[PDB]
Design a protein around this motif. Sequence first.
Motif, PDB file in Angstrom:
ATOM      1  N   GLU C  68       0.824  -1.212   0.000  1.00 31.84           N
ATOM      2  CA  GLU C  68       0.000   0.000   0.000  1.00 31.84           C
ATOM      3  C   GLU C  68       0.861   1.265   0.000  1.00 31.84           C
ATOM      4  N   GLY C  69       1.660   1.404  -1.054  1.00 34.68           N
ATOM      5  CA  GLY C  69       2.470   2.595  -1.227  1.00 34.68           C
ATOM      6  C   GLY C  69       3.505   2.811  -0.148  1.00 34.68           C
ATOM      7  N   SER C  70       4.090   1.736   0.371  1.00 30.57           N
ATOM      8  CA  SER C  70       5.069   1.836   1.440  1.00 30.57           C
ATOM      9  C   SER C  70       6.075   0.705   1.288  1.00 30.57           C
ATOM     10  N   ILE C  71       7.217   0.863   1.952  1.00 32.29           N
ATOM     11  CA  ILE C  71       8.363  -0.020   1.777  1.00 32.29           C
ATOM     12  C   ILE C  71       8.818  -0.540   3.133  1.00 32.29           C
ATOM     13  N   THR C  72       9.242  -1.799   3.160  1.00 29.54           N
ATOM     14  CA  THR C  72       9.726  -2.459   4.360  1.00 29.54           C
ATOM     15  C   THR C  72      11.252  -2.517   4.346  1.00 29.54           C
ATOM     16  N   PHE C  73      11.839  -2.523   5.546  1.00 30.76           N
ATOM     17  CA  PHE C  73      13.291  -2.571   5.667  1.00 30.76           C
ATOM     18  C   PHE C  73      13.875  -3.811   5.009  1.00 30.76           C
ATOM     19  N   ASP C  74      13.130  -4.917   4.990  1.00 28.87           N
ATOM     20  CA  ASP C  74      13.626  -6.119   4.328  1.00 28.87           C
ATOM     21  C   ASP C  74      13.835  -5.874   2.839  1.00 28.87           C
ATOM     22  N   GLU C  75      12.865  -5.230   2.189  1.00 29.56           N
ATOM     23  CA  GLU C  75      13.009  -4.974   0.762  1.00 29.56           C
ATOM     24  C   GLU C  75      14.035  -3.877   0.510  1.00 29.56           C
ATOM     25  N   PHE C  76      14.152  -2.916   1.430  1.00 31.52           N
ATOM     26  CA  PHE C  76      15.227  -1.930   1.340  1.00 31.52           C
ATOM     27  C   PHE C  76      16.593  -2.610   1.379  1.00 31.52           C
ATOM     28  N   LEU C  77      16.757  -3.574   2.286  1.00 33.88           N
ATOM     29  CA  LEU C  77      18.002  -4.324   2.379  1.00 33.88           C
ATOM     30  C   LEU C  77      18.245  -5.140   1.118  1.00 33.88           C
ATOM     31  N   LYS C  78      17.185  -5.717   0.547  1.00 30.27           N
ATOM     32  CA  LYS C  78      17.329  -6.460  -0.704  1.00 30.27           C
ATOM     33  C   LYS C  78      17.792  -5.548  -1.837  1.00 30.27           C
ATOM     34  N   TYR C  79      17.213  -4.348  -1.916  1.00 32.57           N
ATOM     35  CA  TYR C  79      17.680  -3.348  -2.870  1.00 32.57           C
ATOM     36  C   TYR C  79      19.155  -3.038  -2.673  1.00 32.57           C
ATOM     37  N   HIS C  80      19.583  -2.886  -1.423  1.00 28.01           N
ATOM     38  CA  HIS C  80      20.980  -2.541  -1.188  1.00 28.01           C
ATOM     39  C   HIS C  80      21.912  -3.711  -1.481  1.00 28.01           C
ATOM     40  N   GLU C  81      21.452  -4.948  -1.280  1.00 31.74           N
ATOM     41  CA  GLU C  81      22.239  -6.099  -1.715  1.00 31.74           C
ATOM     42  C   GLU C  81      22.397  -6.111  -3.228  1.00 31.74           C
ATOM     43  N   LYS C  82      21.324  -5.790  -3.957  1.00 34.42           N
ATOM     44  CA  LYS C  82      21.432  -5.683  -5.409  1.00 34.42           C
ATOM     45  C   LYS C  82      22.420  -4.590  -5.805  1.00 34.42           C
ATOM     46  N   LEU C  83      22.376  -3.453  -5.107  1.00 31.54           N
ATOM     47  CA  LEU C  83      23.316  -2.370  -5.384  1.00 31.54           C
ATOM     48  C   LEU C  83      24.754  -2.804  -5.125  1.00 31.54           C
ATOM     49  N   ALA C  84      24.989  -3.516  -4.023  1.00 34.07           N
ATOM     50  CA  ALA C  84      26.336  -3.987  -3.718  1.00 34.07           C
ATOM     51  C   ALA C  84      26.819  -4.987  -4.757  1.00 34.07           C
ATOM     52  N   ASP C  85      25.928  -5.869  -5.218  1.00 34.63           N
ATOM     53  CA  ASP C  85      26.298  -6.809  -6.269  1.00 34.63           C
ATOM     54  C   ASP C  85      26.668  -6.076  -7.551  1.00 34.63           C
ATOM     55  N   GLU C  86      25.900  -5.045  -7.908  1.00 33.94           N
ATOM     56  CA  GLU C  86      26.243  -4.246  -9.082  1.00 33.94           C
ATOM     57  C   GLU C  86      27.549  -3.488  -8.886  1.00 33.94           C
ATOM     58  N   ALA C  87      27.883  -3.141  -7.641  1.00 30.96           N
ATOM     59  CA  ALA C  87      29.087  -2.364  -7.374  1.00 30.96           C
ATOM     60  C   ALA C  87      30.366  -3.113  -7.727  1.00 30.96           C
ATOM     61  N   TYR C  88      30.327  -4.446  -7.777  1.00 31.34           N
ATOM     62  CA  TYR C  88      31.514  -5.203  -8.163  1.00 31.34           C
ATOM     63  C   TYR C  88      31.910  -4.914  -9.604  1.00 31.34           C
ATOM     64  N   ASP C  89      30.923  -4.776 -10.493  1.00 36.57           N
ATOM     65  CA  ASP C  89      31.216  -4.542 -11.902  1.00 36.57           C
ATOM     66  C   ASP C  89      31.881  -3.191 -12.128  1.00 36.57           C
ATOM     67  N   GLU C  90      31.651  -2.230 -11.239  1.00 32.03           N
ATOM     68  CA  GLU C  90      32.210  -0.900 -11.415  1.00 32.03           C
ATOM     69  C   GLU C  90      33.714  -0.936 -11.131  1.00 32.03           C
ATOM     70  N   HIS C  91      34.427   0.043 -11.683  1.00 33.36           N
ATOM     71  CA  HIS C  91      35.856  -0.074 -11.950  1.00 33.36           C
ATOM     72  C   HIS C  91      36.767   0.439 -10.837  1.00 33.36           C
ATOM     73  N   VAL C  92      36.242   0.809  -9.665  1.00 30.52           N
ATOM     74  CA  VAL C  92      37.144   1.284  -8.615  1.00 30.52           C
ATOM     75  C   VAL C  92      37.921   0.113  -8.019  1.00 30.52           C
ATOM     76  N   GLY C  93      39.012   0.450  -7.330  1.00 23.33           N
ATOM     77  CA  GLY C  93      39.830  -0.580  -6.709  1.00 23.33           C
ATOM     78  C   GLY C  93      39.158  -1.235  -5.516  1.00 23.33           C
ATOM     79  N   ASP C  94      38.545  -0.432  -4.647  1.00 20.13           N
ATOM     80  CA  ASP C  94      37.982  -0.918  -3.388  1.00 20.13           C
ATOM     81  C   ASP C  94      36.463  -0.948  -3.517  1.00 20.13           C
ATOM     82  N   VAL C  95      35.930  -2.130  -3.836  1.00 17.43           N
ATOM     83  CA  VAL C  95      34.492  -2.280  -4.041  1.00 17.43           C
ATOM     84  C   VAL C  95      33.731  -1.993  -2.754  1.00 17.43           C
ATOM     85  N   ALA C  96      34.213  -2.513  -1.623  1.00 16.16           N
ATOM     86  CA  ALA C  96      33.508  -2.309  -0.363  1.00 16.16           C
ATOM     87  C   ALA C  96      33.434  -0.830  -0.008  1.00 16.16           C
ATOM     88  N   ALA C  97      34.581  -0.145  -0.024  1.00 15.30           N
ATOM     89  CA  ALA C  97      34.609   1.274   0.317  1.00 15.30           C
ATOM     90  C   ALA C  97      33.748   2.080  -0.640  1.00 15.30           C
TER      91      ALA C  97
END
Lengths: 431, 49, 291, 426, 429
Positions: C68-97
């Motif tokens: 109902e037009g609202s977001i849960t922390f679980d799905e927010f965390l899932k979004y951020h896991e997807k973002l972290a997975d995408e961050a590996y493909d990006e070209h910086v040296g330190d993926v975590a940082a």
Amino acid sequence: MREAICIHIGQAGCQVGNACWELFCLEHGIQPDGSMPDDAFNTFFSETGAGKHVPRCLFLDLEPTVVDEVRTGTYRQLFNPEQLVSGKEDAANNYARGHYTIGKEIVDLALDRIRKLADNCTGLQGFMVFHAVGGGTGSGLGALLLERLSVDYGKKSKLGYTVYPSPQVSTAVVEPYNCVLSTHSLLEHTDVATMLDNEAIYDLTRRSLDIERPSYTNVNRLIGQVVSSLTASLRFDGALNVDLTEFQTNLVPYPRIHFVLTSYAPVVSAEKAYHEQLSVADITNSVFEPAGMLTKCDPRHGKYMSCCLMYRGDVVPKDVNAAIATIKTKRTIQFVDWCPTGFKCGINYQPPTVVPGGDLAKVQRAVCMIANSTAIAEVFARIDHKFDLMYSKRAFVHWYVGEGMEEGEFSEAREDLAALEKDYEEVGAES
Amino acid sequence: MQVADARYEQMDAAAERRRQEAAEDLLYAQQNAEAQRVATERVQRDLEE
Amino acid sequence: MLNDSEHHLVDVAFQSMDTNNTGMVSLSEVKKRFFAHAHPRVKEGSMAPSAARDTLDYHFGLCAADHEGSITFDEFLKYHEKLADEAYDEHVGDVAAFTEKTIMELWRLGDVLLPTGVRPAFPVTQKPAGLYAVALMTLVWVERFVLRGIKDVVRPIFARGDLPEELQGYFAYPEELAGMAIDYVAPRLSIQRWYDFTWEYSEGKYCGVEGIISTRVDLESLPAGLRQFVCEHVTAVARGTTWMPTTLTTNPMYKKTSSAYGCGVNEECRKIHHWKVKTFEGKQYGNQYHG
Amino acid sequence: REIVSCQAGQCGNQIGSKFWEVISDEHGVDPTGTYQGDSDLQLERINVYFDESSGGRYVPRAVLMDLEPGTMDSVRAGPYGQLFRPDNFIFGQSGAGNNWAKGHYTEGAELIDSVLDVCRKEAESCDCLQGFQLSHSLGGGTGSGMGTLLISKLREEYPDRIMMTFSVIPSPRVSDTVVEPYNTTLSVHQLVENSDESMCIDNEALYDICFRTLKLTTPTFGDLNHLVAAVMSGVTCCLRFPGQLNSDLRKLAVNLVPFPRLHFFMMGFAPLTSRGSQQYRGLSVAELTQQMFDAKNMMQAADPRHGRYLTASALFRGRMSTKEVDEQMLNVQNKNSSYFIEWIPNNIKSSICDIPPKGLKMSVTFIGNNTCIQEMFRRVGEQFTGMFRRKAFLHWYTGEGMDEMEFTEAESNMNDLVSEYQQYQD
Amino acid sequence: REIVSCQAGQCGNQIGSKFWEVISDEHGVDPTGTYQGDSDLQLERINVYFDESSGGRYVPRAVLMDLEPGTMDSVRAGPYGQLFRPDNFIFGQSGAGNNWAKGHYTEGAELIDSVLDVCRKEAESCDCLQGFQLSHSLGGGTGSGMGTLLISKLREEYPDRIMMTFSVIPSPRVSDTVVEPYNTTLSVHQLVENSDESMCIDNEALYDICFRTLKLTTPTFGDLNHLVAAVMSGVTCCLRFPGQLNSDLRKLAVNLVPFPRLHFFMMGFAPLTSRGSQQYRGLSVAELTQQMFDAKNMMQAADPRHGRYLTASALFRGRMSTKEVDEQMLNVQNKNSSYFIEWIPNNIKSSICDIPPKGLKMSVTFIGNNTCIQEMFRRVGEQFTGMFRRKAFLHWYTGEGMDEMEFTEAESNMNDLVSEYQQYQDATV
Ligand SMILES: Nc1nc2c(ncn2[C@@H]2O[C@H](COP(=O)(O)OP(=O)(O)OP(=O)(O)O)[C@@H](O)[C@H]2O)c(=O)[nH]1
Ligand SMILES: Nc1nc2c(ncn2[C@@H]2O[C@H](COP(=O)(O)OP(=O)(O)O)[C@@H](O)[C@H]2O)c(=O)[nH]1
Ligand SMILES: Nc1nc2c(ncn2[C@@H]2O[C@H](COP(=O)(O)OP(=O)(O)O)[C@@H](O)[C@H]2O)c(=O)[nH]1
Ligand SMILES: [Mg+2]
């Protein structure tokens, strides 16, 4: 008494005089304000009852940026509102205009200021003009002012520090025109002229001072140092004090043979200075080598005709004599046959003072050389060939002919310079 | 020896000049980065448009 | 997969964003707090912040419809896991940082100045250097919430770390203001004078910096929250406030080559005058001034 | 000292608008005309471009000239449109019709009375006028005709003053007008007689710069006007700011024109760097020389490799050691002597100004009197010969007070100019 | 003593990318371009390969080239791709199509002008250019066809600078494209004419080293490229670091080129050992000599035993005594005199550098001017004859501008080089 009036014509004259005056103020302990925080300064600074010391100079440029820079900089309180003349429009690399049209409208007030300075002085030794013959206002107004000075003050000594066009570097294309046209004034109405080209000083800075990016500031500082070494005999005490007329007589053998080359030692940076023992013999050899030359004129290619040495510091006359005898014994340089002595030397106890913000290293002893040499013919034998290429196809001559100069003046100046080269070759001819 | 003593403070002044020039070089590098940022912002603006 | 640092950051973002502690966050609030100018693609220049907002729409639309037009922390965390997975493909040296940096920049978390919300380009404690020490900043503030400022009125002569934590945000570089909706106030023409910046830390005693606010700032346009800190130099002197030692950084872009001619002349002249007198009384041995 | 600016046509109006924007940015002047500069050096030479009123307001010494009054409202809507004086806005009621004759004989003649009234007012206000600075396009009607007619009358009234003209030469690729060669030839024959320095800019090369050098994706005309404005400020940087070795509008000319006819210059700017390569480039005099002499960097569609440089001038800005600029120019000549005329030694003059443009360590503007500039003249002359062999589109000009053989005199003047250029090229 | 590196084709771009990775690792340079080295010696001679920008960005002196933009995209997307200057990426819209004609005359010629502009920009900005270092594969089109154009024009522009060309010579066993004989024949005669040293690499020998010496299970192109990057660094180790016995590219050319046409060399790198056997090995100068002269360690596939050594270059890295490094070469000569040419006393020139590679306490690179280099030329010349006699695959070349005449000249020049090598193989005093 013992005054010497400085003239700074054109942009290059203005910066050179700026460096010279800063070095003189540091030498004599004068603040940029003009008050010191022994009448040894009267030769460059006009004593005033208020405790100030107005410099004995005339800055003079037909364009206002450099004089306004002086009027804005750290020496506002030092430099007089007058003696700092500003024009309205520059000659702009045009000898004809700088000497004919916009020069006559200002030479009258320039001579008024000169008369005021001379009246202030009591024992004026001579005039010291600083200019670059390449620039328009420099060359033209210097020619006109020296004409006026020669026709007004008679046989007063006039020493000129001229930044001639260098063999390869030149910042103007009509610079050969200005050089050949100003050569006539520099020969007749200039008592002594001194080469101060820019390539030689650039190379000297990059070799000895270890400056990978030299600029006009270093060149101006070296010019100030050599001028100070010239005038130190009349500013301070010495074993063999030499006056303007003194080295004038001992340097100029013929009325036309007065153009001279200069060299300085020891030019060195602070880091490399303490690794070397700067003895009198060492500095003399460094001077006589072409590396220390302030001019792109190799003395080996010609014959030395007259040499003048300004010694400063703890130099002893015995070491002076030993060094000059060693130079006589040396083979790589040869003197003209008819001048056996050929050496003038004036010793001073005052050591040179390094300007903060510069790059020269402080030294216990220094030496400057002003030399008439037959090798001097090469700079003129290069500038005339530089000029003839343009003059053959009459390029850039319409600018000079549209400012009141006849086209035959070019030919007259070229013939004068050709005669100058001819008698440079003639004086060195074997008897 | 006094000339050498004064030469030492000459060298210290030279070192001060050198570090001032190093600060100037850092400023110029930051200015280059600033021009980079200005161009990037223009690209972002017309991308929005 | 997010490790502890990113998990802490995403939890802090979700908590600060959900002021009711209900675990139920509105999509409009997601758009409001999404600092889309912090997207790496946007910073590179091949993406639009509005496109970042709409890809956020794509990512969260079905879950918002489910809740109902609202977001849960679980799905927010899932979004951020997807973002972290995408961050590996990006070209910086330190993926975590790069991952912590992207999360903080996107969700406005970290060492963020309290009054206005501007993130410092360089750490607050260090003194300014280079452009951060030459270029003037923009005096900003918050009015009920919209951020409004005046360009080039603050000299960078002071360290922002010496200010109270409730006053730092009013001062910010255009580097920091980049990507933020900033209304602007036209300054008022006036002579080149500089107001001080003073604050009260104890009864009868005050601390501040001298002459940082240009007089072109309109006092009437300034809110009441800053008029109490901005004051004239005479008023500050009579008030007897304590001055933090600032550094005067000369502009080198207008350093004339002839300006370098006369440096050190005063000190060298003092030394040579001492040498001259010491020679005159004759205490000087060796190098002697000869007149 | 003072330089008074005139700008004609919509093209010239926009060029001068961005020129005044960049000058006001350099001199710390807001659109309201007040001074917000952070240095004293920004005021000592403010009189060159801005004149002070009784209340201290600095108003540009600029004249806006156009037959179309529509662009005046666009200038009003412009960010810096409030900076100029209202009376310096000489606009006609009827459009130019993209007609050189309409701009030169019928409406230009009737408005140029007020134009010269304003120009005389500004010249008398100037303490010692150095010259006029006119910006115009040679492909339009009112930019080409009225601008050249103004050049003619200003040369007649002021002999010694310098008429520096920035003409926008049309291109075959950027051909946006069918009477482009008519306008260009009818303008250049006025320029050759009435302009001391007629230095030209070309839209095709502006597009080339914006696509390959600065790598803009969707560059509007704002980028082109920024380029021409930033290279226009460089001729007067030495006047507006102190220099280690400076010059002015005709200290440049005396070194750049060996003969009176040869006074058309080709332009160049450095450093121009793209967003991607912004951080990879180390600013230096060597890198500035790497880009001045690059033919594909020059602001004309005439490759300098096809000609030989007669004269050149490098107006460098920024604190830089003179040894490197001198060495760079000298060794460029030495290593590329095949592209420099042997009878004028050291074809390149070098001048240095201390204050660099805002946002750059060091910059430089290039003036080039290269012989290859005659390629554009050949293109324009060929297009005219094709159109005139059949006598098309000339009736619009003829019915507006143009005799046919005036244009033939203009074409003969171009042929003489191209003959001189080719003669010194070969 | 700056060196400008040029890189052509997919093979050349990837080999040079891994090489620049290795050099940045050795000199302490981050992908962002900053210097995070822990020693002064890294920064002392870093100008040899990197040029400093205003903000301390150390940009490589690399000119990257390919007619296909995909390889340029890959090099930019690489972890160290942001190091390269964006304007050094010179590429075309259409690929070479594995056609030497298309690389040399049609598409590479329309793009060679900008490449030469960039090469001039890099080379003349340096204080004193040592020379150029090109990397390419002769089998491909844009690597070989246009890479040869690079060599031809840089010879006309810089006659006195060193020229060093790493060509990945194709092999019949790992032949993954068919027009390898044509491309290799058309490129070898261009290389032999105007290259100071053409230093060959073979994919099958690289594979053999990876499979047996390094005991890799699934080696990829990066694993293959690491060894050649290592030798690429080792050749200029003496340039970039001080040592007890310094050397340079001109020293290598002088001591390895007795006659102008014999500048095709053998590669060898030591130590190479699997991680399983890495700690089982006593690593010293004797084992360095063992592996360096071992046939299997060579990453060009031609047995040294079948031929005789004209000259050898032992570029040692490491802080070690010099009596042993000299005595090892002396003993090698003295017993294996049958494998060394009689009329050059001490065929082996050895030099010492004080800084070994990072993560290794001493190593060595081998440069071998041998008579077995012509076996690969013969085994590809037989294929060239087989294809050329039947006029096969020549329409693609002749439709782009060439003809049978140039193919015959390339064949004749290559056979002349082979005969020159064989004559000194069987020469008698
Ligand atoms: N030694 C020295 N020479 C300079 C300096 N500045 C300029 N020059 C020389 O002067 C030449 C350029 O002409 P300028 O002397 O500056 O011009 P000017 O004398 O003011 O005459 P105008 O051009 O009409 O203004 C250059 O070729 C330099 O050799 C300087 O600061 N020191
Ligand atoms: N560089 C530049 N060129 C322009 C601009 N506006 C127009 N042009 C060029 O000028 C030509 C048209 O000139 P125009 O504006 O009609 O001149 P007018 O008729 O005298 O007003 C076109 O071919 C454009 O290429 C501008 O803002 N900048
Ligand atoms: N050592 C090595 N060889 C490679 C690499 N990529 C391709 N090759 C070889 O190059 C040959 C094909 O060359 P090609 O890519 O078509 O050359 P190009 O057309 O110039 O790009 C193949 O036989 C491969 O063995 C690489 O990354 N390393
Ligand atoms: Mg001047």
